[PDB]
Coordinates of C-alpha atoms in Angstrom, one line a residue:
Chain A
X1 CA 374.3 90.0 119.1
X2 CA 376.4 86.1 118.3
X3 CA 376.8 84.9 114.6
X4 CA 374.0 82.8 112.5
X5 CA 375.4 80.1 109.9
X6 CA 373.1 79.1 107.5
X7 CA 373.0 74.8 106.9
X8 CA 374.3 74.4 102.9
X9 CA 374.1 71.3 101.5
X10 CA 377.9 71.6 102.0
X11 CA 376.8 70.6 105.8
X12 CA 375.1 67.7 104.8
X13 CA 375.1 64.3 104.2
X14 CA 373.3 61.5 102.7
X15 CA 371.0 61.7 106.9
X16 CA 369.9 65.3 105.4
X17 CA 371.3 66.2 108.3
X18 CA 374.4 68.5 109.0
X19 CA 377.3 66.5 109.4
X20 CA 378.5 65.9 112.6
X21 CA 381.8 67.8 112.4
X22 CA 380.1 70.7 111.1
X23 CA 379.1 71.6 114.3
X24 CA 383.2 72.2 115.2
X25 CA 383.2 74.3 112.1
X26 CA 380.6 76.2 113.3
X27 CA 381.8 77.0 116.7
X28 CA 385.4 78.1 115.0
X29 CA 383.8 80.4 113.1
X30 CA 382.0 81.6 116.0
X31 CA 385.3 82.0 117.1
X32 CA 387.2 83.4 114.7
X33 CA 384.9 85.9 113.7
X34 CA 385.0 87.5 117.5
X35 CA 388.4 88.8 116.5
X36 CA 388.2 89.3 113.5
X37 CA 385.4 92.0 114.7
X38 CA 388.2 93.6 116.3
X39 CA 390.1 93.7 113.1
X40 CA 392.9 91.3 114.7
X41 CA 393.5 87.0 113.8
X42 CA 393.3 85.2 116.5
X43 CA 397.3 84.6 116.7
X44 CA 399.8 87.2 117.1
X45 CA 403.6 87.5 116.2
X46 CA 405.1 84.4 118.0
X47 CA 401.9 82.5 119.6
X48 CA 398.6 80.8 118.7
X49 CA 395.7 79.0 120.1
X50 CA 395.7 75.7 120.4
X51 CA 392.3 73.0 121.1
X52 CA 393.3 70.9 123.7
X53 CA 390.1 69.0 123.9
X54 CA 386.5 69.2 123.0
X55 CA 383.3 68.0 124.9
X56 CA 380.4 67.5 122.9
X57 CA 377.1 66.9 122.8
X58 CA 374.2 66.4 120.1
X59 CA 370.4 66.9 120.3
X60 CA 367.9 67.7 117.6
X61 CA 369.6 67.8 114.9
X62 CA 369.8 70.8 111.9
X63 CA 369.2 70.1 107.7
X64 CA 369.8 72.0 105.3
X65 CA 368.4 75.9 104.8
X66 CA 367.7 76.1 108.6
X67 CA 369.1 78.7 109.8
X68 CA 371.5 78.2 113.5
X69 CA 372.5 81.0 116.0
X70 CA 376.4 80.1 117.8
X71 CA 376.4 81.5 121.3
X72 CA 379.4 82.0 122.8
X73 CA 381.0 82.3 126.4
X74 CA 383.9 82.2 128.7
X75 CA 383.7 79.8 131.1
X76 CA 387.1 80.2 132.8
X77 CA 389.5 82.4 131.4
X78 CA 393.4 82.2 133.2
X79 CA 397.0 83.7 132.1
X80 CA 397.4 80.2 130.3
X81 CA 393.9 78.7 128.6
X82 CA 391.0 79.7 128.3
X83 CA 387.3 77.5 128.6
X84 CA 384.8 78.9 126.2
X85 CA 381.5 76.9 126.2
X86 CA 379.5 77.3 123.6
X87 CA 375.8 76.1 121.5
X88 CA 374.1 76.1 118.6
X89 CA 370.4 76.8 118.4
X90 CA 368.2 76.5 115.3
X91 CA 367.0 80.4 114.8
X92 CA 365.4 80.5 111.4
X93 CA 363.4 77.4 108.8
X94 CA 364.2 77.5 105.0
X95 CA 361.0 78.5 105.1
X96 CA 360.7 80.9 107.3
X97 CA 357.6 80.0 109.0
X98 CA 357.0 80.6 112.2
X99 CA 359.4 78.2 115.3
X100 CA 360.6 78.2 119.3
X101 CA 364.5 77.9 118.8
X102 CA 365.6 74.7 119.2
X103 CA 368.6 73.0 120.7
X104 CA 371.1 71.1 117.7
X105 CA 374.3 70.9 120.1
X106 CA 376.6 72.8 123.0
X107 CA 380.5 71.8 123.2
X108 CA 382.8 72.7 125.6
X109 CA 386.4 73.6 124.5
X110 CA 389.6 74.0 126.3
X111 CA 392.5 76.4 124.1
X112 CA 396.5 77.0 125.1
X113 CA 397.9 79.4 123.3
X114 CA 401.6 78.4 121.8
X115 CA 404.9 79.6 121.0
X116 CA 405.0 78.4 116.9
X117 CA 408.1 76.5 116.4
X118 CA 408.0 75.0 120.2
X119 CA 404.7 75.0 120.4
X120 CA 405.7 75.6 124.2
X121 CA 402.7 76.9 126.4
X122 CA 402.8 80.3 126.9
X123 CA 400.6 83.0 128.3
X124 CA 397.7 84.5 126.2
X125 CA 398.4 87.8 125.1
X126 CA 397.1 90.1 127.2
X127 CA 395.4 92.4 124.9
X128 CA 393.8 88.1 123.4
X129 CA 392.7 88.3 127.1
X130 CA 390.9 91.2 127.0
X131 CA 389.1 90.4 123.9
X132 CA 388.1 87.1 125.5
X133 CA 386.6 89.0 128.7
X134 CA 384.7 91.0 126.2
Chain B
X2 CA 393.0 49.1 112.2
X3 CA 393.5 51.8 109.2
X4 CA 395.6 54.1 107.6
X5 CA 395.1 56.9 106.0
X6 CA 397.4 60.0 104.8
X7 CA 397.5 63.4 105.2
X8 CA 396.4 65.5 102.0
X9 CA 396.4 69.2 101.7
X10 CA 392.6 69.4 101.6
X11 CA 393.0 68.5 105.5
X12 CA 395.7 71.4 106.9
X13 CA 395.2 74.8 107.7
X14 CA 397.1 78.1 107.4
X15 CA 399.6 76.8 110.3
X16 CA 400.4 73.7 108.3
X17 CA 398.8 70.7 110.8
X18 CA 395.2 68.9 110.4
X19 CA 392.3 71.1 110.9
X20 CA 390.8 70.5 114.3
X21 CA 387.8 69.0 112.7
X22 CA 388.9 66.5 109.9
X23 CA 390.4 64.7 113.4
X24 CA 386.9 64.3 113.3
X25 CA 386.6 62.5 110.1
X26 CA 389.6 60.0 110.2
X27 CA 387.8 58.8 113.1
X28 CA 383.9 58.5 111.2
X29 CA 386.0 56.9 108.2
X30 CA 387.9 53.7 110.6
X31 CA 384.3 53.8 111.8
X32 CA 382.5 52.9 108.4
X33 CA 385.6 51.0 106.8
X34 CA 385.0 48.3 109.9
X35 CA 381.5 48.1 108.2
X36 CA 382.4 48.4 104.6
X37 CA 384.6 45.9 104.6
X38 CA 382.7 43.9 106.0
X39 CA 380.9 44.3 103.0
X40 CA 376.9 45.7 104.6
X41 CA 376.5 49.8 104.9
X42 CA 376.4 51.0 109.1
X43 CA 372.9 51.7 108.2
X44 CA 370.2 50.1 107.6
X45 CA 365.3 50.1 105.8
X46 CA 364.8 52.1 109.2
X47 CA 367.7 53.1 111.2
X48 CA 371.0 55.0 111.5
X49 CA 374.0 54.9 114.2
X50 CA 373.4 59.0 115.8
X51 CA 375.9 60.5 117.3
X52 CA 375.3 61.2 121.5
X53 CA 378.3 63.0 122.4
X54 CA 382.4 63.0 121.5
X55 CA 385.2 63.7 124.5
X56 CA 388.5 64.6 122.4
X57 CA 391.9 65.2 123.6
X58 CA 393.7 66.3 121.8
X59 CA 398.1 66.1 121.7
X60 CA 401.2 66.6 119.2
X61 CA 399.9 67.6 115.7
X62 CA 400.1 66.1 111.6
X63 CA 400.7 67.4 109.0
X64 CA 401.1 67.2 105.6
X65 CA 402.2 64.1 104.0
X66 CA 402.3 61.9 107.2
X67 CA 400.7 58.8 107.7
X68 CA 398.4 58.0 110.3
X69 CA 396.4 55.1 112.2
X70 CA 393.3 54.9 114.0
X71 CA 393.7 52.3 116.4
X72 CA 389.7 51.1 117.6
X73 CA 388.5 49.8 120.6
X74 CA 384.6 48.9 121.8
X75 CA 385.1 50.7 125.2
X76 CA 381.2 49.1 126.1
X77 CA 378.5 47.0 123.9
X78 CA 375.1 47.4 125.1
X79 CA 371.3 46.8 123.7
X80 CA 371.0 50.3 122.8
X81 CA 374.2 52.0 122.6
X82 CA 377.9 51.8 122.0
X83 CA 380.6 53.7 122.8
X84 CA 384.3 53.4 120.8
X85 CA 386.7 54.6 122.1
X86 CA 390.1 55.6 118.8
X87 CA 393.2 57.3 119.1
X88 CA 395.0 58.3 116.0
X89 CA 399.2 58.0 115.6
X90 CA 401.4 59.8 113.1
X91 CA 403.7 56.3 111.9
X92 CA 405.6 58.0 109.4
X93 CA 406.9 61.1 107.5
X94 CA 406.3 61.3 103.7
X95 CA 409.6 61.7 103.5
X96 CA 410.2 58.6 105.2
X97 CA 413.3 59.3 107.7
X98 CA 412.8 56.9 110.1
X99 CA 410.5 58.5 113.7
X100 CA 408.9 57.4 116.1
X101 CA 405.0 56.8 116.5
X102 CA 403.5 59.3 118.4
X103 CA 399.7 60.2 119.4
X104 CA 397.8 63.3 117.8
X105 CA 394.4 62.4 118.4
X106 CA 392.3 60.6 121.3
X107 CA 388.5 60.2 121.7
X108 CA 385.8 58.6 123.4
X109 CA 381.8 59.1 121.3
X110 CA 378.5 57.4 121.8
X111 CA 376.5 56.3 119.6
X112 CA 372.3 55.3 119.9
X113 CA 370.2 53.3 116.8
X114 CA 367.1 55.9 116.4
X115 CA 364.8 54.7 113.4
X116 CA 365.0 57.2 110.4
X117 CA 361.4 59.2 110.4
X118 CA 361.4 59.3 114.8
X119 CA 364.4 59.7 116.0
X120 CA 363.0 56.3 118.4
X121 CA 365.9 54.7 119.9
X122 CA 365.6 50.7 118.7
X123 CA 367.9 48.5 119.3
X124 CA 371.2 48.3 117.0
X125 CA 370.6 45.4 115.0
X126 CA 371.6 41.9 115.0
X127 CA 373.7 42.0 111.6
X128 CA 375.6 45.2 113.1
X129 CA 375.8 43.7 116.8
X130 CA 377.2 40.2 115.8
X131 CA 379.9 42.2 113.5
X132 CA 380.9 44.5 117.1
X133 CA 381.3 41.9 119.0
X134 CA 383.5 39.4 116.3
Chain C
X2 CA 376.0 89.4 95.6
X3 CA 376.7 87.7 98.3
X4 CA 379.4 87.5 101.2
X5 CA 381.9 85.2 102.8
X6 CA 384.3 85.4 105.6
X7 CA 387.7 82.4 104.9
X8 CA 388.5 80.4 107.7
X9 CA 390.8 78.4 109.5
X10 CA 388.9 75.9 108.1
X11 CA 389.0 77.4 104.4
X12 CA 392.4 78.2 104.2
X13 CA 395.4 75.5 103.3
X14 CA 399.0 74.7 104.5
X15 CA 400.0 77.1 102.3
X16 CA 397.6 80.3 104.0
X17 CA 395.2 80.1 100.8
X18 CA 392.2 79.0 100.3
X19 CA 392.1 75.0 99.7
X20 CA 390.8 74.7 95.8
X21 CA 387.6 73.3 95.3
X22 CA 386.9 75.1 98.6
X23 CA 386.1 78.4 95.7
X24 CA 382.9 76.0 94.2
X25 CA 381.1 75.8 97.9
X26 CA 381.1 79.9 98.3
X27 CA 379.8 80.1 94.1
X28 CA 377.2 76.8 95.1
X29 CA 376.5 79.3 98.8
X30 CA 375.2 82.0 96.4
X31 CA 373.2 80.0 94.4
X32 CA 371.5 78.5 96.8
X33 CA 371.0 81.7 98.6
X34 CA 368.7 83.3 95.8
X35 CA 366.2 80.4 96.4
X36 CA 366.8 80.9 100.3
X37 CA 366.7 83.9 100.8
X38 CA 362.4 83.6 98.6
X39 CA 362.3 80.9 101.0
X40 CA 361.9 78.3 99.4
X41 CA 364.6 75.4 99.0
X42 CA 366.7 74.6 95.5
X43 CA 364.6 71.9 95.0
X44 CA 361.0 70.4 95.1
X45 CA 358.3 67.5 95.6
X46 CA 359.2 66.0 92.6
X47 CA 363.5 67.3 91.0
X48 CA 366.6 68.6 91.6
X49 CA 369.2 70.5 90.2
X50 CA 372.0 68.0 88.8
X51 CA 375.3 69.9 87.7
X52 CA 376.3 69.0 84.3
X53 CA 380.3 70.3 83.7
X54 CA 382.3 73.5 85.2
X55 CA 384.7 75.9 83.6
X56 CA 387.0 76.9 86.4
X57 CA 389.5 80.1 86.9
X58 CA 391.8 80.2 89.2
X59 CA 393.5 83.8 89.7
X60 CA 395.0 86.3 92.5
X61 CA 394.4 83.5 95.5
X62 CA 393.0 85.1 98.9
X63 CA 393.1 84.0 102.1
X64 CA 392.1 83.8 106.0
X65 CA 389.8 86.7 107.4
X66 CA 389.0 88.0 103.9
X67 CA 385.7 89.2 103.0
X68 CA 384.6 88.2 99.7
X69 CA 382.0 88.9 97.2
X70 CA 380.0 86.6 94.7
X71 CA 378.9 87.7 91.9
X72 CA 376.4 84.9 90.1
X73 CA 374.2 85.5 86.2
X74 CA 372.3 83.9 83.9
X75 CA 374.5 82.9 81.3
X76 CA 372.3 81.0 80.0
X77 CA 367.9 80.1 80.6
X78 CA 366.2 77.3 78.2
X79 CA 363.4 75.1 79.1
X80 CA 365.7 71.9 80.0
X81 CA 368.8 73.8 82.2
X82 CA 370.6 76.6 83.5
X83 CA 373.5 78.2 82.8
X84 CA 375.6 80.6 85.7
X85 CA 378.7 82.6 85.7
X86 CA 380.0 83.0 88.9
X87 CA 383.6 85.7 90.2
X88 CA 385.1 86.1 93.6
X89 CA 386.4 88.7 94.6
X90 CA 388.2 89.9 97.8
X91 CA 386.4 93.1 98.9
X92 CA 388.3 93.5 102.5
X93 CA 391.2 92.4 104.4
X94 CA 389.9 91.2 108.1
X95 CA 392.3 94.4 109.5
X96 CA 390.3 96.8 107.6
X97 CA 393.5 98.3 105.5
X98 CA 391.8 99.4 102.5
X99 CA 392.1 97.7 99.8
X100 CA 391.0 98.2 95.5
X101 CA 388.8 94.3 94.6
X102 CA 390.8 91.8 92.9
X103 CA 389.7 88.8 91.3
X104 CA 390.2 85.2 93.0
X105 CA 387.9 83.4 91.0
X106 CA 386.0 82.7 88.3
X107 CA 383.4 80.0 87.2
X108 CA 380.6 78.7 84.3
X109 CA 378.6 75.8 85.4
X110 CA 375.3 74.1 83.3
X111 CA 373.3 73.0 86.0
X112 CA 370.1 70.5 84.3
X113 CA 367.4 69.7 86.4
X114 CA 366.5 66.2 86.5
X115 CA 362.9 64.3 88.1
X116 CA 364.3 62.1 91.1
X117 CA 365.2 59.0 91.1
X118 CA 364.5 57.9 87.5
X119 CA 367.6 60.8 87.4
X120 CA 365.9 62.1 83.9
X121 CA 366.6 65.6 82.3
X122 CA 363.0 67.3 82.5
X123 CA 361.7 70.9 82.5
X124 CA 363.0 73.7 84.7
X125 CA 359.2 74.8 87.0
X126 CA 357.3 77.5 86.8
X127 CA 358.6 78.8 89.9
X128 CA 362.5 78.0 89.6
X129 CA 361.9 79.2 86.2
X130 CA 360.5 83.2 86.8
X131 CA 362.7 83.7 90.1
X132 CA 365.6 82.1 88.3
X133 CA 364.6 85.1 85.7
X134 CA 365.4 87.7 87.7
Chain D
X2 CA 395.6 54.0 90.1
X3 CA 394.5 55.1 93.6
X4 CA 390.5 54.5 95.4
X5 CA 389.0 56.1 97.8
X6 CA 385.6 54.8 99.4
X7 CA 382.9 57.8 99.4
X8 CA 382.3 58.1 103.2
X9 CA 379.1 59.9 105.0
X10 CA 381.9 63.5 104.4
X11 CA 381.4 62.7 101.4
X12 CA 377.5 62.8 101.4
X13 CA 375.2 65.3 100.4
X14 CA 371.8 65.1 101.0
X15 CA 371.0 64.2 98.4
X16 CA 372.4 61.1 99.3
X17 CA 375.2 61.3 96.5
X18 CA 378.5 62.9 96.4
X19 CA 378.6 66.4 97.4
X20 CA 379.7 67.8 93.6
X21 CA 383.2 69.3 95.5
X22 CA 384.8 66.3 96.6
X23 CA 386.2 65.0 93.3
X24 CA 388.3 67.2 92.7
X25 CA 389.6 67.3 96.1
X26 CA 389.8 62.7 95.3
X27 CA 391.6 64.2 92.0
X28 CA 393.9 66.2 94.4
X29 CA 394.9 63.4 96.5
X30 CA 396.2 60.9 93.6
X31 CA 398.2 64.2 92.7
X32 CA 400.0 64.6 95.9
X33 CA 400.0 60.5 96.2
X34 CA 402.6 59.9 93.1
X35 CA 404.7 62.8 94.9
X36 CA 404.3 61.1 98.2
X37 CA 405.4 57.8 97.0
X38 CA 408.6 59.3 95.6
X39 CA 409.2 60.0 98.7
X40 CA 408.2 64.3 97.8
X41 CA 405.8 66.6 98.7
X42 CA 404.8 68.6 95.4
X43 CA 406.1 71.1 96.5
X44 CA 410.2 72.3 97.7
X45 CA 412.2 75.2 99.1
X46 CA 410.6 78.2 97.3
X47 CA 408.3 76.8 94.3
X48 CA 404.5 75.9 94.7
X49 CA 402.4 74.2 92.3
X50 CA 399.4 76.5 91.5
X51 CA 396.3 75.8 90.1
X52 CA 394.9 77.8 87.2
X53 CA 392.5 75.8 85.5
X54 CA 390.3 73.1 85.5
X55 CA 387.5 72.5 83.4
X56 CA 385.5 69.7 84.3
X57 CA 382.4 66.9 83.5
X58 CA 379.7 65.0 86.0
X59 CA 378.5 61.7 84.8
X60 CA 376.4 59.2 86.8
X61 CA 377.0 60.0 90.7
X62 CA 378.8 57.5 93.0
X63 CA 377.7 57.0 96.7
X64 CA 378.0 56.3 100.4
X65 CA 380.4 53.3 100.9
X66 CA 380.9 53.0 97.0
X67 CA 385.0 52.4 95.6
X68 CA 386.0 54.7 93.4
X69 CA 389.1 55.2 90.7
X70 CA 391.0 58.4 90.2
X71 CA 392.8 57.7 87.2
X72 CA 395.7 59.9 85.7
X73 CA 397.3 61.0 83.2
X74 CA 399.7 63.5 82.0
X75 CA 397.9 66.1 79.3
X76 CA 400.3 68.8 78.4
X77 CA 403.6 69.5 80.3
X78 CA 406.1 71.6 79.4
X79 CA 409.5 73.2 81.4
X80 CA 406.2 76.3 82.9
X81 CA 402.9 74.1 83.5
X82 CA 401.4 71.1 83.1
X83 CA 397.9 69.8 82.4
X84 CA 396.6 66.1 83.6
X85 CA 393.6 64.7 82.9
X86 CA 391.3 62.6 85.6
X87 CA 389.0 60.2 84.9
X88 CA 387.0 59.0 88.2
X89 CA 385.0 55.1 88.0
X90 CA 382.9 53.8 90.8
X91 CA 384.1 50.1 90.3
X92 CA 382.0 48.3 93.2
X93 CA 379.3 48.4 96.2
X94 CA 381.0 48.1 100.0
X95 CA 378.0 45.4 99.6
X96 CA 380.0 43.5 96.5
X97 CA 376.2 43.5 94.6
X98 CA 377.8 43.2 91.7
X99 CA 377.6 46.0 89.0
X100 CA 379.5 47.1 85.9
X101 CA 382.1 49.6 86.5
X102 CA 380.8 53.3 85.8
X103 CA 382.2 57.0 84.9
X104 CA 381.7 59.4 87.6
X105 CA 384.2 62.5 87.0
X106 CA 386.1 63.7 84.5
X107 CA 388.5 67.2 84.8
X108 CA 391.0 68.2 82.7
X109 CA 393.0 71.0 85.1
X110 CA 396.4 73.3 84.1
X111 CA 399.2 73.5 87.2
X112 CA 401.6 76.3 86.8
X113 CA 404.7 75.9 89.2
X114 CA 405.3 79.6 91.4
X115 CA 407.6 81.3 93.7
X116 CA 405.3 81.7 97.2
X117 CA 407.1 85.3 98.4
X118 CA 405.5 86.9 94.2
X119 CA 403.5 83.5 92.9
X120 CA 406.0 84.9 89.1
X121 CA 405.9 81.8 86.8
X122 CA 409.2 79.8 87.2
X123 CA 410.8 76.5 85.8
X124 CA 409.0 73.7 87.1
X125 CA 411.4 71.5 88.7
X126 CA 413.5 68.5 86.9
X127 CA 412.9 66.6 89.9
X128 CA 409.7 67.5 89.8
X129 CA 409.4 67.7 85.8
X130 CA 410.0 63.8 85.6
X131 CA 408.1 63.1 88.3
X132 CA 405.2 63.9 86.4
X133 CA 407.1 62.6 82.7
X134 CA 406.9 59.2 84.1

């Protein structure tokens, strides 16, 4: 259940918290791992997913050594696009002292599926549709 | 407002800019606004904090292209500022003429807070004055 | 040993891991050694500072592959430590069987510095005892 | 010489440039040489591949500083090139006076290879003369 990410030096900035764009990387890993875990890449012989839009809110900033949990759900799945909701919670600190998980970031992201050359909108592959549903 | 080149570090296996990197180009344009006016976008006890982002992705840019990031102030209040930024591709590395095209747009809201407490304070006079000009 | 997956963020337009990212992987492996034991690789008075890196690049890794970072203490002195790290690809996303292959190796020298001054001091007892194992 | 600004994306929790980022700066400087001659550093069946890096780290750079990347050819063969690249910090964002200081120095070897095979091939004539210049 879910994906867990450790916050490393590479993820932090001079303020001592995770650099804002890195939360998007964590969300991306979560999405791709769903495919990797079914032994496939999130792309196929004549199509690829393309991000259309993101809505993101920032909550308590994460910091070095914390373990973050990325929670993913399908908001909406159509023939031509999918919208995902992803939330990130800090679930552990580096000291492994007891803590109530706290929200760090949330996003809603819309993806289309397109041909590589043309970049024209095509249907999400049936196999990927099934995987998303699950 | 600011121009930057797409380098290998910026691209992914699909041959276009990895999506999150557009947020980096936008951040550079925000910070350079301050840097070129000889200040850091932070001070003694306080920093800007991002509250929310709304971003739209359009035609992807790729290796060696020159991008132009245009930044405008959508809203400026005592305690927050909302910026709208758009990125256009304006040149190929090869130089073949091309009509510039939109690549990305974002609307981002920033607060200003005390570092230690994250308590919201007014955007400091220094930065407010700069943002007014 | 620590394992990492190659994600889109790690790849470049040639479909392989962008070269500098291998250093990030090695860093993760070093930090996890401390994280495992419920501490940060830094304390109240000091931080580790990289002095030098010798790195070699072998067969490139690609999207979805699993890499294993192997770390050994080449040399441990009062004031510095030299770590040798190798990265091997051990799995495909598809789980198609494969002989592991070397991707990257680095030898890095770290000193420990009294923060402010950045002046070199002995590695602390806690890290010393850990680093020995 | 290429100049690069230190942005938040470049810094870590210790307030200095994350170590691997210096390799990115050196890469930009290399690719820009090619982009300026209106070419990408690759052609129809060949790419440059990094084989090895030797690097030393000196005084760290921080937020807002301007870094200058100086590049020279240490060795050019038909098969491979070794470049020496040094990074100096030359200014603060604030323009508070400072004597430029060395931040990073690397020697990097590159081969030119087939994509399909990764078998080495002669550096292209156009690229060989670019490199020599």
